[PDB]
Amino acid sequence: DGLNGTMMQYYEWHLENDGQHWNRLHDDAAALSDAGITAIWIPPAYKGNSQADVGYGAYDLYDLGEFNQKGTVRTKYGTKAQLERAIGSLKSNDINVYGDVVMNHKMGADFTEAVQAVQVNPTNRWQDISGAYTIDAWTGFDFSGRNNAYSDFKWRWFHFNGVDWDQRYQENHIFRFANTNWNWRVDEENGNYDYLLGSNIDFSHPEVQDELKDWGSWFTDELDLDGYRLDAIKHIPFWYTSDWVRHQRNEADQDLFVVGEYWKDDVGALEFYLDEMNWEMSLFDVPLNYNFYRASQQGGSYDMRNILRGSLVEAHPMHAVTFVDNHDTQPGESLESWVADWFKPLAYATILTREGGYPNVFYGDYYGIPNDNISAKKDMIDELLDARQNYAYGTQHDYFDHWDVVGWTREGSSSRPNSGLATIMSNGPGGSKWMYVGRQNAGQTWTDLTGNNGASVTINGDGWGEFFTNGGSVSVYVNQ
Ligand code: NA
Ligand code: NA
Ligand SMILES: [Rb+]
Ligand SMILES: [Rb+]
Ligand SMILES: [Rb+]
Ligand SMILES: [Rb+]
Ligand SMILES: [Rb+]
Ligand SMILES: [Rb+]
Numbered sequence: 114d115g116l117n118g119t120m121m122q123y124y125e126w127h128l129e130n131d132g133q134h135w136n137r138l139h140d141d142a143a144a145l146s147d148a149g150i151t152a153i154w155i156p157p158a159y160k161g162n163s164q165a166d167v168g169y170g171a172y173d174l175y176d177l178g179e180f181n182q183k184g185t186v187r188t189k190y191g192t193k194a195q196l197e198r199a200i201g202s203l204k205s206n207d208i209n210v211y212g213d214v215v216m217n218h219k220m221g222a223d224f225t226e227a228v229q230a231v232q233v234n235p236t237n238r239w240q241d242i243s244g245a246y247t248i249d250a251w252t253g254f255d256f257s258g259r260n261n262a263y264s265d266f267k268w269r270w271f272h273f274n275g276v277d278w279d280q281r282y283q284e285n286h287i288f289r290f291a292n293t294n295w296n297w298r299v300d301e302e303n304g305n306y307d308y309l310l311g312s313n314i315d316f317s318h319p320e321v322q323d324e325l326k327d328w329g330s331w332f333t334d335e336l337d338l339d340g341y342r343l344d345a346i347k348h349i350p351f352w353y354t355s356d357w358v359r360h361q362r363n364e365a366d367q368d369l370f371v372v373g374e375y376w377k378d379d380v381g382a383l384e385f386y387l388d389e390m391n392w393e394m395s396l397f398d399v400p401l402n403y404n405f406y407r408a409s410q411q412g413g414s415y416d417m418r419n420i421l422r423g424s425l426v427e428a429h430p431m432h433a434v435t436f437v438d439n440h441d442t443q444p445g446e447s448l449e450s451w452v453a454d455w456f457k458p459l460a461y462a463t464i465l466t467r468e469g470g471y472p473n474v475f476y477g478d479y480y481g482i483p484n485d486n487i488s489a490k491k492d493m494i495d496e497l498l499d500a501r502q503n504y505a506y507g508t509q510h511d512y513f514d515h516w517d518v519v520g521w522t523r524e525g526s527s528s529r530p531n532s533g534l535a536t537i538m539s540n541g542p543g544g545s546k547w548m549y550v551g552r553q554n555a556g557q558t559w560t561d562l563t564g565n566n567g568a569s570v571t572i573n574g575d576g577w578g579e580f581f582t583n584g585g586s587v588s589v590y591v592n593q
Contacts, residue, residue, distance in 0.1 A: 115506075115528060115529060117149075117151075117501055117502060117505060117506070118151040118152060118471060119149050119150050119151055119152070119465070119472055119473075119474060119498060119501060119502070120150075120151070120152040120153070120154055120211070120372075120434065120471060120472065120473040120474070121145065121150045121152070121153055121154065121473065121474040121475075121476065121479070122154045122342075122436075122439060122440075122473060122474070122475055122476050123138055123153050123154065123155055123156075123476050124155070124156045124167075124190070124440070124476050125440055125443060125475070125476045125477035125480075125482055126167060126440040126443055126446055126477075126482075126484075127443075127482060127483070127484035127485075128189070128190075128476075130164060130165040130189045132164075132178075132187040132188070132189065132190060132191045132192070133191060134189070134190035134191055135178075135190050135191035135192070135195035135196040135198070135199045136191060136195055136198075136199070138153070138155070138199040138202070138203070139195070139198055139199040139201075139202040139203075140202075142199075142202040142203050142205075142206040142208065143202075143206050145206075145208065146206040146207055146208055148495055148498050148499075148502075149495075149498035149499065149501060149502035150208060150474065150498070151207070151208060151209065152208060152209040152210070152211060152339070152340075152370075153203055153208055153209070153210055153211070154211045154213065154342045154372075154473070155190075155196075155210060155211070155212060155213060156168045156190065156213050157169060157171060157213045157214075157215050157344075158177050158178065158188060158190065158196055158212065158213075158336070159171060159172075159173060159174045159175065159176055159177050159178075159188070160172050160173045160176035160177075160178070160180070160182055160183055160185075160188055161183070161188065161189075161220070161221065162183060162220045162221040163183055163184055163185070163221070164183070164184055164185035164187065164188065164189060165189055166188075166189060167189065167440065168188070168189070168213060168215070169215055169344065170220040170221065170311065171215045171218070171219055171220060171311075172219065172220060172221035172254075173254070173256050173259065174215075174328050174332065175256070175259060175262070175263045175264055175328065175331070176256070176258075176259055177193040177196060177335070177336075178190070178191055178192045178193045178195075178196065179192070179193040179194075180256075180258040180259045180262075181258045182256060182257065182258040182259065183221055196336075197336070200336060200337065204337070209339035209340065209370065210336070210337075210338055210339055210340075211338065211339060211340040211341055211342050211370060211372070212332065212333075212336060212338050212340075212341050212342065213341075213342045213344060214329070214332075214341045214342065214343055214344055215344045215345070216314065216325050216344070216349060216357075217309060217311075217313070217314065217344065217345040217346075217348050217349050218309065218310060218311035218312055218313050218314055219254065219268060219273075219311060219312050219314065220310075220311040220312065221251075222250075222251035222252050222253050222254055222268075222312060223253050223254055223255050223256075223257065224251070224253040224255075225249040225250060225251050225252070225253065225280045226249065226250060226251075226252050226253055226269065226270040227247050227248075227249060228247065228248055228249070228250050228252070228270050228290055228291075229245050229246070229247055229290070229291035229292070230245065230246065230247070230248045230250070230279070230288040230289065230290055230291055231243055231244065231245045231246075231288065231289050231291055232286040232287065232288060232289075233286075233287045233288070233289045234287075234304075235287050235303065236303050236304070237303060237304035237305075238287065238289065238295055238303055238304050238305040238306070238307065238308060239295075239304040239305055240304070241289070243286075245291040247281070248276075248279035248280075248281050248282070248288060249279060249280040249281035250270055250273075250276040250278075250279065250280070250288070250312070251276065251278070251280065251312065252268065252269055252270035252272070252273055252276070252312050253267075253268070253269060253270070254267060254268035254269075255267055263331060263335075264324075264327070264328065264331070266320075266324045268312075270290070271318075272314065272315065272318060272320075272321050273290065273312045273313055273314055273315055274289065274290045274293035274294070274295065274296070274307075274313055274314075274315035275287070275288055275289050275290055275293075275295075275307070275308045275312075275313040275315075276288050276311070276312050276313070277308070277310060277311075287308055289308075290315075293315055294315075294317065295307040295308065296313075296314075296315060296316055296317070296348075296349065296350040296353075297350055298350060298351045298352065298389070299347065299348055299349065299350055299351065300347040300348065300375075300377065300382070302377075306347065306348055307348060307350075308348070309345060309348045313348075316349075316350050316353045322353065322356070325357060326356075326357055326360045326361075329357060329360065329361050330360070330361060330364040330365070333361060333364070333365050333369070334364075334365070337367075338369070339367060339368065339369065339370060340368075340369050340370030340371055340372070341361075341369070341370075341371050341372070342372055342373075342374065343371065343372065343373035343374060343394070344374055345374060345376070346373040346374060346375050346386075347374075347375045347376060347377060347382075347386070351386060351389045351390070352389075354373065354390070355389065355390055355391070355393070358371055358390075358393055358394060359393070370395075371393070371394035371395065372394065372395045372396065372397060372434045372471075373386075373390075373394050373395075373396050373397075374396075374397055375396050375397075375399070376397075376399055376441075376448065377399060378399055378400050378402075378403040379400065380400045380423055380424065380425050380427075380428065383396050383399070383400075383425055384425075384428070384429070387429070387432060392429075392432055394432070395431075395432040395433060395434050395471060396425060396432065396433065396434065397433075397434045397435075397436060397473075398424055398425040398426050398433045398434060398435045398436070398464075398470065399425070400423045400424050400425060401421070401423075401424035401425060401426060401427075401433075401435060401464070402436065402437070402438070402442065402450065403450055404419075404420055404421070404422070404423060404424055405420075405437055405452045405456065405457075405460040405463075406442075406450040406451070406452055408420060408456055408459075408460075408540060409451075409452040409453040409455070409456035409457070409460075410453075412540070413517060413540050413541030413542070413584075413585065414541075415540060416516040417513065417515065417516055417517060417518070417519045417539075417540055417541075418513045418514070418515065418516055418519065420463065420513070420519070421463075421513070426464075426467075426469050426470035427469075430468070430469025430470050431469075433469070433470045433471070434470070434471045434472075434473055435463075435464035435470040435471065435472045435473065436464065436472065436473040436474075436475060437452050437457060437460040437461055437464070437475060437478065438450075438451055438452055438457075438475050438477065438478065439475055439477070440477070443477050443482060443485070444482075444485045444487075445485070454487075454488070454490075455585055456540065456585075457478065457490065457493075458490075458493050458563075458586070458587050459538045459540065459586075459587045461474075461478075461490075461493070461494055461497050462497055462500075462536055462538060462587045462589060465497045465498070465500065465501045465505070466497065466500050466501060466504075466505045466521070466523070466534060466536045466589055467505075467509065467521060467536075468505070468509045468523070472501070474494060474498075478490045478494060479491055479494055493563070496562050496563050496564075496589075497562075497563075497589065499562060500534055500562050500589045500591065503529070503531075503532060504523065504525070504531075504532050504533060504534040504562075504589075504591045504592075505523050505532075505534055506523060506525055506526040506528075506529050506532040506533070507523050507524035507525040507526040507532060507533060507551070508523070508524040508551065509521060509522065509523050509524075510522045510524075510548060510549050510550070512546060512548055514546075515544070515546070516541070517539045517540060517541030517542060517544065518537065518538070518539040518541075518543075518544040518545075518546055518582065519537075519538065519539075519546075520535065520536050520537030520538060520546055520548055520580060520582075521535075521536050521548075522534065522535040522536070522548050522549065522550045523535075523550075524550060524551030524553070524554065525551065525553075525554065525592075531591075531592050531593075533550060533551065533554055533557075533591065533592055534562075534589055534590065534591045535548055535550055535559065535570070535578065535580050535589070535590045535591075536587065536588070536589045536590075537580040537581070537582045537587070537588055537589075537590075538582055538586060538587035538588065539582050539583075539584055539585065539586065540585055541584060541585070542584045543581070543582050543583035543584045543586070544581070544582065545579050545580060545581040545582070546579070546580055547577055547578070547579050547580075548577070548578065548580060549575075549576055549577055550572060550576055550577070550578060551576045552574070552575060552576030553576065554572050554576060554592070555572050555573060555574050555575070555576055556571070556572060556573075556574075557571070557572045557592045558570070558571045558572075558592070559571075559572065559578065559590040559591055559592050559593075560590060560591070560593060561588040561589065561590050562588075562589045562590070562591050562593065563587065563588055563589055565582070565583065565586045565587065565588050566581050566582055566583060566586070566588045568580070568581040568588075568590075570590055578590075
């Protein structure tokens, strides 16, 4: 028993469209469990716009690589049977499975429909910039191929309220359907960030509200999930996300972890959303994400004392999911804010060896991102996992007392023999620092699990030791 969980996003933007990913997941289970991974966040497992869609161009939430639709049976990751087989593997290996959930929109409509619409100011959706006129939007969904298995709900323009393309005159505009309202409440960037892309779902319709609740349960039961990764929730009316969440926990016997992706470098904005959520879920720590980014970008001059400043984990470590990067921040993607190889080791140590926050390992970092010649960091990360899995326990002591060199420690716990660790790093010239680690660990001799520093540190009578690190490096001394 015990604890210390570590989540892993098992996919990157440029994975190969060989539909063999679910299978890899299945053969990788044990290795991941053993390495310290306790939970896996899988990508949207339902049929998207096309076979090579990463998952967010969601077409049919009921087709998990089972029906021949959108030019393919399988999804980019594989067939429904292979995914169920993978999940079984993860389960028997004690890894929780969280599903990525896309409810903000739908894409790949089978046919267009005449709709009265108005163009809105892109920087202020509240403002129209054209009169109402008929446009041909792609909103008709009949799911030919599924033959109403699991559900016969058909989508139509009136279930939506906006699109960014008009097939009639063939132009791009942010179209608000006439006489419909933008969802609310939602992020106020651009005035009203309800619309992002694809066919935007309007949740005011009760039949919509139930179809997604009904689907959610179907989904959860069909895959035997343990939680969800909620996509683009800052564009989804808050009240409904909340209702939806509460609805799922109501139908499912098993516990359900919930992390929502409210993407905004602004902790307040996330706290507000969390208030509205009555803290019934966690949120990826995006400010932290950009903190790491800013640091990776600036170099040593960056004042390491403010590395956690602004983060979410800093203020509500209980509802923060920490990470360094993802498919949106990887090079070339929409939200690019990639943490360079030099700083990435420090960032991972920060979210992996500290007590606050639920850390998430990025598939791209772990196995590398070939497309962009980014090396796999399995080695650097496994050592930290070993740290987290076996040494990151007990009382914590922080030392963000210097702009370049900073560190922290964990006294270890009675329940976990030999646990205990001291993390130190510098984003500038190297240095050393005296840190407390628990008088009960006196006389022990600690060494760096990362091998970035040969120093052998001995704990004195008072429980103090002097730890070292070279420039731009991180070390995690433990009693191995
Ligand atoms: Na929306
Ligand atoms: Na510095
Ligand atoms: Rb089809
Ligand atoms: Rb329940
Ligand atoms: Rb990042
Ligand atoms: Rb200990
Ligand atoms: Rb090493
Ligand atoms: Rb030792």
